[PDB]
Symmetry: D3
Subunit: 256 residues, 6 copies
């Protein structure tokens, strides 16, 4: 039981807790409170003993274009602590610690904090070879977010990570496939995300047959311990280091 | 240059950036924005190339009784993320990363988050043997804050830390002295914090004569690297784990 | 629900799961299966949602004199893997990962693997100033066990640990107190462990009044993460490195004298 | 160089090479607990021999090893499994983790389960042909990660690929092995002559070591091992202890009796 | 402001500090003092607040053939501490800690300590698909240098690293590309390193347009923290462990042939 | 057991003990760069001797060692200091960090600077009497932490005490040493007979090792060392490189010429 959000729905089918970004007209751009809502959904899925997989699906041609930049305080610092710092530490933490198998259905590109979240998922399936991830921090006057400090070198390599981050270049489909970031490309048309989403769920129902599901969670629990400390450390430092960029004002100015 | 705060002042004398909690009538209890203000002062001291020591002094009989519990949101979670999570990650981070030598003049007891901050200082001087630190998390329905997860076992030992934290008992003067937590007890009366504060500064002016001050900072930089990762990791996890305690409501109920 | 063991009992009183070593006539020396039993009891306490504290108490003048050295295999290696390696790695792990507050009531000396278990507890109370911990590995032809590789330097300091371990010397009461290892000395006579055990429980019932007990567990969960990895790494290495000492035969030959 | 004999596993020394041979092709080189222990004892023996610089693990038939032999006294279920499963796994895993000689696996066919974990702990792997695969069927058996796979699989195959394969009981196939540089050379020989493959690897190795200062190999390995030695030791202890509740719950046993 | 070195030049163009190995007739082989000079140039670039990228370029058909083996002490140990240990620990540290984005323009092969420095760069661009990195330590009677203990497994994988290091085999272009080690291959002829160097700089001037350059440094500062400790630990151990190989004499005797 | 002679430092072996003796009391056992290197070579020699289980460091006179001797060709200031300071410090510090034999310091009087760092890297310290102290005067010399003090001082004395002493150039006095268990036994002998102290320590050590299985001592030390070995190796590299800018800036030199 949780409040409703017009941009994001969820349902449970058997062992699957399915989260759906449902605002395709705005490329599923997300405001601060929507990221918090996502964290609350993960925490809900995490407390449900019938759930073994948490599946994040979207809508339209984009997975998510990232933070919504369309959408009181004693200082600039106090403002940004409340608005940026808090939201980012919270949602990043919710993904880092999540105990269920986290699967992203990548129906199109993801950008920024949303793309950070994709990189925190355990398994990623792509609609087709036109998906990409973009982390435009250098263009926005920002730094790494959502644990990308750790996740990008981990999943794409350190050298590739520098090229992409330092020069604001996308991690394209080819780079994703070369690094095993995508576990399966479904090769379906971008115009039917809904069909892609349904097909992934159908294959998942097939793939879990016969498995002892608590083994999945037991294995994940050990696997997570490989990098949990690095992610926790990066979360705190990412969010605090970002502050001077917001307080300096550059990302605001750039928000044109 | 920074806004004024009636509860906390600062000044610079030579290589010393001196912060003064000046609200003795309320035992220097601090609201969220005051903790943020403290962080901003540290960040200011840290950017000043003439500053080598950041000295935190208080007033009255208490160093600080902790968070002021006398002193809109889509959910309980969103509320507490904004109010508790953000403030705590920010201020704790400001202390953890501070590059100047941090000295606390402990003019009386410190409690809770304020006492966490005392434990993050590099050097602590006590007014007299009646000072103590209390971390009442078990009584408040909360958990460790302000990096105490790491600082208390580090500076007091693991066994002593469990006895005190699990049973809501103070770290008294004797325990502080036995662990070398206090570098000097000035043995002055509790009724003149001002005299104590002045005496510490006078001794400091003497002790820095002849020293190559950049050596102090160079040494601190290496020393800090011993535990910086543990503190950063604990900061993120403390603040996120606390959330369920606030959201469950217990600390509020207890706030009687 | 678990098998009975005549050397070790347990009961639950409110939020306390109380384990009692009850073989004072043999100084509560423990065989392999007894150490395993202890691990099983911890795992039972850990699964009980009404338990917040696991309290380990003993009987007589000793907490425990350690492994009972009075008390089928293709090789010496296979034998010792089954008998020593497995038992040690299991019981040590049960202590390292335990989520309830672990309190040891130290009613007298502890030796060897039993003393290692004392050093893995979160809080230790002593009956009087004659208690000591002895880790006689250098004398037995063995090495560090039960996570002592980590726990001793952590709770006693590195230099003191080397003096004691390298020369088979006890960590005496004064050293325990100087390092805050003991949270309270009850100063009671050695002849009444029972009274000491009761007195600790009585104080604990008082001390928990008013506390939010889930906070205790929440704080412990974070505190444990400071050293959990070091303990897990040491456990694996301790048990495997011991093997060559058992297989070489020295601790056996030293046992016969 | 003295140790008991084991009809399923032989060893010999040729120059700087200590060569271990799984020789039970009729049963796909499936291994019982004591055989895994025996393997650990052989590694410890190679490790103490100052003339040995490389420890080479070779097999026979069409499989490297189908894993633990599931065809093949205790106060409790816990005591039983501590003795049988916990002890064997911690010991053999440790023997591979700490081994100081260059460990080379000659992969003559598929490996499964704990045997496949051991392949993933080797320093260098050569494949007979592109039909080899590694399968870690823990999710199907009602078990969890073993033999340091918690660390080795993400390390050598990537995290995302590891989750897909482990969570859904899918093999790490040749293509994935090649894409991740897991296999250093595919010999492209027929599956029907493991023997020829084994001999060819050794013949190339004798060529490749000519002119090398062999203590440099060990000196380098000693530094390389330190990158992950702690993570492996931590995983070993946790893997074996966490597995216990799966054995004690009984699921893997049940699943065994359903063939 | 720094001394001149006839083998290595530098200049600054906007936000780029450009270092150029300019001794193609000797395959840009470097003596101890040249490696030290390189470290000094990095430290200079690192202190210049207008610099955001430090670009290392070379000349001819090789990036660098490595340490120049053509080119007073109480002991063999004292000699090698002064000559090998000190130089290696200093230059390796200068690369590990560098705060500006470090880009290598790989105009041909690199060998040994020079190849180690390539592997410490943040981004590498290749002239064409004939480049390779060779770390011939097993052949020279040496061990890992310049942080390769960490960088090679990190950027090439553990198994590939063992094959190459244990058997003195090159990390060839295909391996580099498969691991994303090379961010762009320019596919230009080996005969014009100069054109390649110019082309990389031209693209870089384009790629930085519109970027907030302090963001680059801020991101690097966080990225570096992933492995900084492993690199610092390896540096100390690599240099000290090499010593016995030099003192034993093997690399010397191998040098004479 | 063969090495050059050094008039300032001798060594001998008595049974399982390798005993190193600083023998220059007239100059407070102050040590030049090459003497620190020599010490490292002696540790490496003791470390290779299979009959040695304990390495005992003893001195002479009223001081253990007053530290680096400041009475006692390069393309740059940087090259000079890399050769003279960096190399010497990384080498000797490393020799202590990695030493596998039980290292015992017989503290016959004060130790200062790098020599005091080396005392703090020993496993066990015995004091002649309660007038010993350790001083780390880096802040006064215009230097930073050396010889692994970055790690050893907080580890053995606590963080807060370490900041008070290092930041303000104050000694770690006997009381602080005793309170932190840094000293395992104070012999309470007069400062005028270091020799008698040295002999008494050795006599007790011969008593204390009777009946022990000495390989157990080394086996235990090997596991104990792994608690902090990484932190020490990381600190060594950073300490020596960070120091460079202090030497190159020139401050410690200036401060040297002001006696």
């Amino acid at each position: 039981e949780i409040r409703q959000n017009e941009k994001i729905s969820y349902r449970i089918e058997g062992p699957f807790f399915i989260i759906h970004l449902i605002n395709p007209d705005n490329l599923n751009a997300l405001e601060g409170e929507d990221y918090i809502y996502l964290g609350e959904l993960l925490e809900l899925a995490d407390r449900n003993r019938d759930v073994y997989f948490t599946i994040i699906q979207s809508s339209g041609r984009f997975f998510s274009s990232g933070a919504d930049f369309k959408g009181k305080y004693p200082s600039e610092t106090s403002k940004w602590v409340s608005n940026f710092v808090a939201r980012n530490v919270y949602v990043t933490d919710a993904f880092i610690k999540h105990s269920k198998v986290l699967i992203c259905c990548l129906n199109g590109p993801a950008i920024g904090l949303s793309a950070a979240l994709v990189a925190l998922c355990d398994i990623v399936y792509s609609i087709n070879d036109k998906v990409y991830l973009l982390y435009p921090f250098a263009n926005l006057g920002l730094i790494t977010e959502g644990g990308t400090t750790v996740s990008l070198p981990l999943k794409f390599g350190t050298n590739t990570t520098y090229e992409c981050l330092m020069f604001n270049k996308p991690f394209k489909y080819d780079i994703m496939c070369e690094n095993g970031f995508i576990s399966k490309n479904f090769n379906m048309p971008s115009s039917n995300a809904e069909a892609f989403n349904a097909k992934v769920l159908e294959e998942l129902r097939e793939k879990v047959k016969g498995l002892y599901l608590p083994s999945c969670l037991g294995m994940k629990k050990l696997l997570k311990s490989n990098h949990i400390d690095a992610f926790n450390k990066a979360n705190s430092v990412e969010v605090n280091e970002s502050l001077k960029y917001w307080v300096d004002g550059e990302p605001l100015k750039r928000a044109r």
